[PDB]
Each structure stands twice: as structure tokens, then as C-alpha cells.
Curated annotation (Swiss-Prot), chains A, C:
Functional description taken from the UniProt entry: Acts as a component of the translation initiation factor 2B (eIF2B) complex, which catalyzes the exchange of GDP for GTP on the eukaryotic initiation factor 2 (eIF2) complex gamma subunit. Its guanine nucleotide exchange factor activity is repressed when bound to eIF2 complex phosphorylated on the alpha subunit, thereby limiting the amount of methionyl-initiator methionine tRNA available to the ribosome and consequently global translation is repressed.
Full-length numbering of the shown residues: 237 to 593 of 651
Keyword annotations from UniProtKB, A to Z: Acetylation, Cytoplasm, Initiation factor, Phosphoprotein, Protein biosynthesis, Repressor, Translation regulation
Gene Ontology molecular function, alphabetical: enzyme regulator activity; translation initiation factor activity
Keyword Nucleotide-binding: no
GO cellular component, one term: cytosol
Location in or out of the cell: Cytoplasm, Cytosol
Disordered, as annotated region: 328-355
Species assigned in the record: Saccharomyces cerevisiae (strain ATCC 204508 / S288c)
Protein name according to UniProt: Translation initiation factor eIF2B subunit delta
From Swiss-Prot, chain B:
Family: Belongs to the eIF-2B alpha/beta/delta subunits family.
GO biological process: cytoplasmic translational initiation; regulation of translational initiation; translational initiation
Organism field: Saccharomyces cerevisiae (strain ATCC 204508 / S288c)
Gene symbol of the encoding locus: GCD7
GO cellular component, one term: eukaryotic translation initiation factor 2B complex
Keywords noted in UniProt: Cytoplasm, Initiation factor, Protein biosynthesis, Translation regulation
Alphabetical list of PANTHER family matching this protein: TRANSLATION INITIATION FACTOR EIF-2B SUBUNIT BETA
Name of this chain's protein: Translation initiation factor eIF2B subunit beta
Function in brief: Acts as a component of the translation initiation factor 2B (eIF2B) complex, which catalyzes the exchange of GDP for GTP on the eukaryotic initiation factor 2 (eIF2) complex gamma subunit. Its guanine nucleotide exchange factor activity is repressed when bound to eIF2 complex phosphorylated on the alpha subunit, thereby limiting the amount of methionyl-initiator methionine tRNA available to the ribosome and consequently global translation is repressed.
């Protein structure tokens, strides 16, 4: 059946609409669930590496694995309880960590596929062709697109560069790595780190693993870092029907700063991340997590100090809340690198109707 | 001028220097107090015979102190104030010794045109007055301060390091008729623990407290009503040095959204010297606190700073013990406390 | 004392900084109150003409009259209960309607005067010179100041000008009259008026009575007349020690519009209007009146009509609140003509120390 109720810490007065609670340690579940989904959920819940791009790929891989493992029952057809199973999986995912736009798209695609082939064909012939098709799709709309984006970026970069970067966006890491290795230009990389997830640190580590000249900074230290420095790059999660940048935590402020100090910002996005859902603020739907992330006192993740703070429930009238997904302003980013080479962010849903 | 003249007459200068260098002394108020004490010691013990020479000596001492530590503005300010106090008395004396018209309190054309007493006691009294002034600032702010914040309004608080700002907040919170929601920005490499402490204090006081990370400033900005700075030093044109980390960006954001930006500090923190360079006055922190290891960290050059400088364009209000002032007006206040020649030493 | 408390209309959830109601119909009054004060109160309660400048003059006149009527008693001295009486008067005034900074200043001056003359001089000789002094003061800080303002305006205003004005400030009316008759110039005077007060209308009427081309303007139709307009003067009430104009009704909007569209805003002010008290928004200290003024259909002030409106407590939660005095911004009004000839609004209290 699962688990219900029992939530840690205060519920707060403001920003109460989305799930923030749940299974962290498993106790009593339905005896039919494939464990790979559960494992994935466990990973996603306590993840520090993933950021919009790889999650969907991982999900796809999991689905493929499931298909490979899937065996049709002797009585009922191929699609009878499969849909129910899928629904259950979705519910589990939501309980663990809310579904992204890419994930939704993937789900839609899966549904379409299900509709395409009606229950009449044998087992070993259908899924052989399905898995191949899915692989082909993956090759087409993801990796190739990424490659195209990279190549576009390559021509767009001039001579003598000093760049400030943020996030654990895989595409950006790929880009920077490419710059370092195959282009052999005068590239300087400055990294910004955030409190909820150590993405900046990871980026820095990756850079080190290549051998790049790295400056390391935070959200607070920005007034002195400019005083020569030109380009600013950000990692996007999804672009809505309005045209606003619906992305991760510390991006919008950086963009604003860039705008203030002359030189504009450039953001990268895929040709599948676009959504039909309409929202213009972070209050509508937001990725909210447990206040356990904002407990550690600086330095590193595993330290555990008995300093000043370490209580939430016992404290009378105290609201410790943090947000993960933000909505950045429309006019501030100028450059968008998508499947159609180059374009403005004001296009919004030009690819959505195109499909 | 070296320390050859002062060795057995005054010894505490070295101790003061030591306190400055290795940061044994903490909080600008304490520094100011120390400076006052030093001045008192100088006055009670040393010999003068002449007045101009004494003034020159004092100036030299001030210069030396400045050279020893540039980030200690309060120390300088107090000295300047004392000099100003001396100067007026000296001027008065000269008029009696010899034995004038002015449109206002000070004249510009007097510089162009050619122009024993118990002054020691007066000088001593000046120091006492200064001490008294230092003692209570919050009592002269609260009569103006608890008039701005209203019901169902939301406050945003960068820099909780200052002791005055907290007090100001507390005084406002005391009132039963007034209710407000508080958003607190953390400040990672320099302000975190202090911020936490502030939050705890707020909780204790029984007010609605919201702890906000440095990245989550943008999302809540549609609801933000007022902005308050925990500044450490005030200057001529309006620009201020803030008490470490996470002030500039927030101010910029406020400016963008046209959110009112308040500042509470005091006139002892106010300096008659100009902040011509950000790089000269602002001191930087430590690299060790950010990231562990040393051998791979030779490649990873980390940038982190203590103090923060905010332009006078963003900040509009400077409420002190006297009253409410502007960045376009505060210069005159400084002049009323520090004289024309006393600026350069 | 009279009547206190028991008033219609709710306290309201939004905007409750000042007390909202006071005596209007006379019943059971103290047998020592001078009738001129009472009459003034009756007038102010439902006034259409006066605003800041003439009110203070009227008050001064009343005070003079009181002084003339006053004689030193055999038992009590000249400075024994006069101050108490003054305080009582002030309290009455406050009860009736909130007061201006000029009035306060006048009160202060009176108090000073009271202290200055020692109770030893002949009584007849005392008040003889007192009333003369007060007259002189009036001539100086009002009439002479007005003249100075006029002269300032003269040098600055070019040949053939279009002026857009708001309210019923007497000084501005005087200036316009001067422009019309004495100097003889081509003037186009556009006057804007609101719903609850017909001050603009009155101004227009006055202009007509002289012989000036007048355009009647409204809040609903503002942008149509600007898009031509060269010079804008606002109805001044009080300038604060920050650089903000605490003024009557929708002047702030006008100022904003001016800022947007080319030309800066100009303000004419008295030397005694300045305040050392500081505030930066409309929420701080609001001047309130009864919602009874906005019940009837417009056309004229007294109508008494049967229609639809006339419910404050009868219907399911109905609040009909309005503000009389608003805040004008800092950077938008730059021009200030005072008793000390020239200065800007950024120069907040430079004249306050000079006096």
C-alpha cells in the first residue's frame, strides 16, 4: 500500500502548494514492484550531481531495462495491468521527487508508443523493435542535438575570453571541456557555487580533471570579481509558453548583475524541454525539499558540527524554508542555443506547435 | 615622525598596534573606545608649552595610527573630532589674545582673505562627550525608526553583523500594534554563523522569521517592502562600507525593483575622508575556510572578501542619533563634526 | 469638553495609521470658547476653496482677533492660562481635522513671543506692540514671500507659456493672475480636478473671472492632452527633510508622467512650509475624511438624490475608503522657488539651519 503522513519540521505560512515531504527508509510495500525503479527513486531523492539534462536519459534507460525484463502473462494481454504499473511508478516518483517537463514529455512519448501498437503481436518480435526504436529516438533528439549545440557554440566563441559559469548542467560541462581540449584558445573559467546542491564544486572538480585555470567564487562575492571579464553562461531546465526562464536556483540574480555591468547573458536549451503549461512566478509550482540540506556549517557536506543550530520542531515560531527551482526574467537573457542553431527567447512556443 | 619621543611617556601605542594587526580587538566601537583611552593617556601625561606644535604632534600621531591600520575608520574619526573640538577653542583663544563677521556658521571667503589658557580641561571634556555619544546611539534613532514599518509589510535584511541594526529591529518588534514578516539573507563565507545567531534571536523575540539562502533572493522580491543595511562605516558622498558579505547584490536588486533602501549606523562611524578606491579600503578574507586540501588548491585560486562597498545611488536614508539624513546631505553633518584642515593629516 | 467617540464606518483592514471619524453640529459647548474658532471649524469640516496657504493666514487672523479681545485679569497674570487656552484650541483643531506644518510653526512662534515679553510691562502697551509685530511677521513670511516667489517665477517663465496646474494653491492662482493682467502674456492654463473635491474647478472659474483660456482636465483623461505641454506646476503643501513633497491627491501620477515625457516638474513653495520630520511613503501619515462625499452622483456638491449608492454597513462587507494627501517623489521635482530665492528639492533642509 505504501506510506502516508508524518512530516518533519514546520509547515510555514507562505509558499504552500507543492509537495515537500514520504519514504526515505523503506517499510512495507506492494509485492510486485521492480526494484530498479525504487533504487532510482532512492538515488534521485539524495542526489547531488544531476541537473535537468541527465535525469531524463536515466529514466529512459530504466524504462528500456524494464522493457527488456518485461514478460507477458499467459492470461491477460500485453497492455492490461502494464498501465496500472506505470501509474504506480509515476506515483512513487512523485512521492520521491516531483516530475520534470522532460520526464512528462518522455511519459507522453511512451503513451503514444503504447497506442501505436495494438495488442495482437507476439512478445519477442514487438519489444525487439520497440527498444531499437526508442534507442534511435534517443540518438536523434538528445545526443545529436547536444553535439549540434556544441558545434554552434564553437563558432560563436571569439578570441580572448573570460567567463563566469554556474550549475551542474552537463551540456555546459561538455562545452567547457571542449574549449579546454580541442579548441586550444585563451579560456578562463570562473565558477559560482550554491547551498542546496554542490554543483559549482563538481564543475570545478571536472575542470581540474582536465587542467584548466579556475577561479572559484560564490553568490555573495560578485562586487569584486569583475574588477576584463566578459561572457556569462547559464544552464536552463525548461522554457514555458510565456518565454520566461524556468530554471534552477542562483541564475536570475547573476543575470541581473551581468545586465547591470554592461555585458549580456547566454543560455543553452534543448528542442524538447518546451512546455504548454503557463506560469509567471515561482509560487505556482516549485521544487521544495526538506530543510536537512541547510544544516551543515560550511566547508564540506559530511562534517557534522555541534555549533549553534540543530533544531526545527522544538523551536517556537521558526520557518526555515529554501527553494530549488526559480523563474528568471524574460528580457535579461539575449542568446538561446537550441536545435535551430540560434534564436531569441521571445519565440516561446515556436517549436511546440512544430513538434 | 618615529616613536623615539614616546617610549616611557606613552607605551600603549605598541599594544594598540598589536591589537590592530593580529585582530585581537573586535568591533569598531571597541576600537573607538581604545582610541579614546589612548588620547586620554596622551593628554594626562605629556607636556606641551606650545599649542600649534602640540596640534602638529597630534596630527603626526593620527597619521601613524592610520599607517598602522587603514580599515579602522572609527579610530581616525574620533581623533578628527577631538582635533576639531580643540581647534574651535584655539580659535576662540586667539581672539582674546589679540585683544569679525560671518553670514553662516562657516565661510568660504575667510580662507582667501588674510586672517596661556585652560584649554586642557576643555579637551578632556571633549573626550568624555565623545564617549557619551558612543555609549548611546539607538536611543536617538528609535524615535524616528519606529515610524517607517507598517502592518502586513515584509522586511528584507542583509548584513546582520551590526549590533545596532538588531537593536533597531527589536525596538520595532516590541510594539504590540505593529506586525511584520522578516526575510533574512545568509551570507556564506563571512556572515553565516552571525546570520544564524540573528535568526535565533528573532525566534526568541517571538516574531515570524524566514531564513533565506543567498540564491533565493529573486523569487521573493515581488513581496519585499523595505531594505535595511548593517553598515560599518559612512563616508562623504554617501557611499558606505558594510559589515562583511552579501550586501551589494541585494542592494542592486532593490534598486531594480525600486524598493526603499534604509541605513542605520551613527556619526562616529562617519568619515570625512573620501572612498576614491574600492581596492584600497576594502580588505579581503581567507581562502582556507572555503575548500579543503592544499596541493590541488594551488591550481584552484579562490577569491573571497570581508567588507563590501555599496554606491550612494542605491541608498537614500541615513537615520542617526540626531535625526533622519540623506546621502546628499550627510557631508554637512561630517563638516559640523570635523574641520576643514583636519581632513588631511 | 464636548463630544467624543461613537462614529459610523469600520476601522478597515487596509490603511489605519491615523484616527478616522469629531464635532460638526454644535450641542453643549463650553462658555469660554471664542466664536471665530468655532466658525472656522465649521468651515474646514466642509470646505472647497482653501488649501495649506490661506488656512494658516486665517488662523493667524483669528489669533490676532482673540488677542485684541483679550485683556489681563486682576488675579491671574498675562502668562498663566493663555498657553492652556492655546493648547485647548489646538486639541479642538486636531479633533476637527489634522493640521499642517505651517500652523505648527506659527504656534511655536507664538509660544516664543509669549516667553519673550516679561509680565511687568503695562498691559495696554503690551498688546499694542504685539499685534503690530504679528502683522509685520505676517507681511514678511507670507505676503513678501509670495511676492518673492512671483518675482522668481517671472525671470524663469519665458514669453508665451503653457502651464498645467492641480489643486487650489493660492500662490499659483496669484501667479497666474499676474501673468494675465500685470505683465500681459499669452497663457494656456490646463487645470486638472478630481471626484471628491472641486478645487481645480474653482481655480478654472477664478481664471475665467479674470479672462484666461482654460482647459478642464480629469484623471481618466490625462495622456490625451500631453501627446504640446511644456511647463508643469504642482500644488505644494509641505516639503520634508528627505526631498519628498507631501501634497494633495493625484499629483504624484502627473509628476511621473512628466518624468516619462521629456520635461521636469516645477514646485513653488514658502520659506516656512519646510518640515524637519521625515517620511518616505503615503502609508506613513495619511489625512482622512468621511466616505460620505463619494456617495452621490457628481455634477454639483449639494444634490440629494435617490438611486443605488448609500450602503456602508447594510450590504455584505463594503469599504469605500479614500486618501486626501499623497506623497510625490524625490528626483522628479527639481525646481524650488522660496524666500531664499533659489534651491532644489535635493537640498532638503539647507534653509532650515539658515532660517
Amino acid at each position: 500500500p505504501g506510506i502516508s503522513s508524518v512530516i518533519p519540521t514546520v509547515l510555514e505560512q507562505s509558499f504552500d502548494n507543492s509537495s515537500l515531504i514520504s519514504v526515505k527508509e523503506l517499510l512495507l510495500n506492494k509485492d510486485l514492484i521492480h526494484p530498479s525503479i525504487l533504487l532510482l527513486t532512492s538515488h534521485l531523492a539524495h542526489y547531488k550531481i544531476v541537473g535537468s539534462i541527465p535525469r531524463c536519459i536515466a529514466m529512459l534507460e530504466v524504462f528500456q531495462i524494464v522493457i527488456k525484463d518485461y514478460q507477458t502473462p499467459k492470461g491477460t494481454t500485453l497492455s492490461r495491468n502494464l498501465t496500472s504499473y506505470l501509474s504506480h511508478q509515476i506515483d512513487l516518483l512523485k512521492k520521491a521527487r516531483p516530475l520534470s517537463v522532460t520526464m512528462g514529455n518522455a511519459i507522453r512519448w511512451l503513451k503514444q508508443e503504447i497506442s501505436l501498437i495494438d495488442p495482437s503481436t507476439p512478445d519477442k518480435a514487438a519489444k525487439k523493435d520497440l527498444c531499437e526504436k526508442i534507442g534511435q529516438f534517443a540518438k536523434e533528439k538528445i545526443e545529436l542535438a547536444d553535439q549540434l549545440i556544441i558545434d554552434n557554440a564553437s563558432t560563436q566563441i571569439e578570441e580572448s575570453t573570460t567567463i563566469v559559469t554556474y550549475g551542474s548542467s552537463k551540456v555546459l560541462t561538455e562545452l567547457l571541456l571542449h574549449n579546454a581540449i580541442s579548441l586550444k584558445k585563451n579560456i578562463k573559467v570562473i565558477v559560482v557555487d550554491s547551498r542546496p546542491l554542490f554543483e559549482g564544486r563538481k564543475m570545478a572538480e571536472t575542470l581540474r580533471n582536465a587542467g584548466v585555470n579556475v577561479m572559484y567564487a560564490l553568490i555573495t562575492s560578485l562586487d569584486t570579481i569583475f574588477n576584463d571579464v566578459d561572457y556569462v553562461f547559464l544552464g536552463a531546465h525548461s522554457i514555458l509558453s510565456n518565454g520566461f526562464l524556468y530554471s534552477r536556483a542562483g541564475t536570475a540574480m547573476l543575470a541581473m548583475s551581468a545586465k547591470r555591468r554592461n555585458i549580456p547573458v547566454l543560455v543553452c536549451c534543448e528542442s524538447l524541454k518546451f512546455s504548454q503549461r503557463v506560469q509567471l512566478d515561482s509560487v505556482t509550482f516549485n521544487e521544495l525539499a526538506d530543510p536537512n540540506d541547510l544544516v551543515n556549517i560550511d566547508y564540506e557536506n559530511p562534517v557534522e558540527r555541534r555549533g549553534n543550530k540543530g533544531a526545527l520542531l522544538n523551536q517556537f515560531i521558526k520557518e526555515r524554508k529554501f527553494e530549488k527551482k526559480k523563474l528568471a526574467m524574460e528580457n535579461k537573457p539575449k542568446g538561446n542555443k537550441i536545435g535551430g542553431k540560434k534564436g531569441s527567447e521571445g519565440e516561446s512556443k515556436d517549436a511546440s506547435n512544430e513538434e | 615622525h618615529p616613536n623615539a619621543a614616546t617610549s616611557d611617556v606613552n607605551v600603549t601605542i605598541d599594544t594598540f598596534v598589536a591589537k590592530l594587526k593580529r585582530r585581537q580587538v573586535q568591533g569598531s566601537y571597541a576600537i573607538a573606545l581604545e582610541t579614546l583611552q589612548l588620547l586620554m593617556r596622551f593628554i594626562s601625561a605629556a607636556r606641551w608649552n606650545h599649542v600649534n606644535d602640540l596640534i602638529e604632534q597630534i596630527r603626526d600621531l593620527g597619521n601613524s595610527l592610520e599607517k598602522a591600520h587603514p580599515t579602522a575608520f572609527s579610530c581616525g574619526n574620533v581623533i578628527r573630532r577631538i582635533l576639531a573640538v580643540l581647534r574651535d577653542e584655539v580659535e576662540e583663544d586667539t581672539m582674546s589674545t589679540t585683544v569679525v563677521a560671518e553670514p553662516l556658521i562657516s565661510s568660504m571667503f575667510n580662507l582667501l582673505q588674510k586672517p596661556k589658557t585652560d584649554y586642557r580641561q576643555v579637551a578632556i571634556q571633549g573626550i568624555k562627550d565623545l564617549i557619551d555619544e558612543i555609549k548611546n546611539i539607538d536611543e536617538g534613532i528609535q524615535q524616528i525608526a519606529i515610524d517607517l514599518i507598517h502592518d502586513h509589510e515584509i522586511l528584507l535584511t542583509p548584513t546582520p553583523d551590526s549590533k545596532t541594526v538588531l537593536k533597531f529591529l527589536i525596538t520595532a518588534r516590541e510594539r504590540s500594534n505593529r506586525t511584520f514578516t522578516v526575510l533574512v539573507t545568509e551570507g556564506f563565507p563571512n556572515n553565516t554563523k552571525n546570520a544564524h545567531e540573528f535568526a535565533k534571536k528573532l525566534a526568541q523575540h517571538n516574531i515570524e522569521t524566514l531564513v533565506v539562502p543567498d540564491s533565493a533572493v529573486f523569487a521573493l522580491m515581488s513581496r519585499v517592502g523595505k531594505v535595511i543595511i548593517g553598515t560599518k562605516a559612512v563616508f562623504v558622498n554617501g557611499g558606505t562600507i558594510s559589515s562583511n558579505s552579501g550586501v551589494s547584490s541585494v542592494c542592486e536588486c532593490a534598486r531594480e525593483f525600486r524598493t526603499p533602501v534604509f541605513a542605520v549606523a551613527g556619526l562616529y562611524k562617519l568619515s570625512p575622508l573620501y572612498p576614491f578606491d574600492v581596492e584600497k579600503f576594502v580588505e579581503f578574507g581567507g581562502s582556507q575556510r572555503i575548500l579543503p586540501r592544499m596541493d590541488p588548491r594551488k591550481r584552484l585560486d579562490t577569491v573571497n572578501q570581508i567588507t563590501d562597498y555599496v554606491p550612494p545611488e542605491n541608498i537614500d536614508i541615513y537615520i542617526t542619533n540626531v535625526g533622519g539624513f540623506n546621502p546628499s546631505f550627510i557631508y554637512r553633518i561630517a563638516w559640523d563634526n570635523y574641520k576643514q584642515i583636519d581632513v588631511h593629516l
